[PDB]
């Protein structure tokens, strides 16, 4: 149904270790399709998905030039930001940017994003309106004023409404077989006794795409949100993801617990129990 395109930029300074490293990664939903690393032997925007390989020389050359220009701008940004925070020239600092578009099943713009961070804290974000900014502090207000004077928000909105939407629609058609295919999780429940009176029920979900999923445990039809150990969704290495949810139950009460699974790839939410 609905899709997203995102570019993730990391610019990290390393004083005494050369110029800041600039890394850009492009994603369509949970599929990476491009990368650019200034630390590569020969930095270029490089394919990371088969469906992008078909893009011509004008694409790759246009994108490589844009990345090198972005790398230069973010190297200057790191100098400015250090100044805006009255920071030492010895410390290592990080600027991060995440931007892109969300489209619906019709491929129409749902919403646009352009968020920036400085040392892992929010710095400036383009608002849902794609016309104003949210500066996190007085330093980010200086950036705001420079952007409000250059009307950067207009140029962003024009990219986010035009190019971002147009290109993502094209990628979705090119990567039709994978990007528009949801793989449901392969599910099962494991049982591990802890003591004489306790046991762990683990609800597994494997081989699913995209990463978004809901795994919950219910005891007598009541969510066990507090007592549920939920691991972070993890990539398998083959496009797919894995997750588990565990609950510690009293021995003999196993049949009162149900695991609930919600995933895009499933026609209806699954309900599973430990089958001894």
């Amino acid at each position: 149904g609905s899709h997203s395109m995102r570019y993730f930029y990391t610019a990290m300074s390393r004083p005494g270790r050369g110029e800041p490293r600039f890394i850009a990664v492009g994603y369509v939903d949970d599929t990476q399709f491009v990368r650019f690393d200034s630390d590569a032997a020969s930095p270029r925007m490089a394919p990371r998905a088969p469906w992008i390989e078909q893009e011509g020389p004008e694409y790759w050359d246009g994108e490589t030039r844009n990345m090198k220009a972005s790398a230069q701008t973010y190297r200057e940004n790191l100098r400015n930001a250090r100044g805006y925070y009255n920071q030492s020239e010895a410390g290592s600092h990080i600027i991060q940017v995440m931007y892109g578009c969300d489209v619906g099943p019709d491929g129409r713009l749902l919403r646009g994003h352009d968020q920036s961070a400085y040392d892992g804290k929010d710095y400036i974000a383009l608002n849902e309106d794609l016309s104003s900014w949210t500066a996190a502090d007085t330093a980010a207000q200086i950036t705001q004023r420079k952007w409000e004077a250059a009307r950067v928000a207009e140029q962003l909105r024009a990219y986010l409404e035009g190019l971002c939407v147009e290109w993502l629609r094209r990628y979705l058609e090119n990567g039709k077989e994978t990007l528009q295919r949801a793989d449901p999780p392969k599910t099962h429940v494991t049982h591990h006794p802890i003591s004489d009176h306790e046991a762990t029920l683990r609800c597994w979900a494997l081989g699913f795409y995209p990463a978004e999923i809901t795994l919950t445990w219910q005891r007598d039809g009541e969510d066990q949100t507090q007592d549920t150990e939920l691991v972070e969704t993890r990539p398998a290495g083959d496009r797919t993801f894995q997750k588990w949810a565990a609950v510690v139950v009293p021995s003999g009460e196993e049949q009162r617990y149900t695991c609930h699974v919600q995933h895009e790839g499933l026609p209806k939410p699954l309900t599973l129990r430990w089958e001894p």
């Binding site: 850009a24 930001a81 600027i95 950067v152 990219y159 190019l163 290109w167």
Partner: peptide
């Protein structure tokens, strides 16, 4: 396709 927009801090 990446943003061709210069974001100078």
């Amino acid at each position: 396709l990446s943003s061709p927009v210069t974001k100078s801090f």
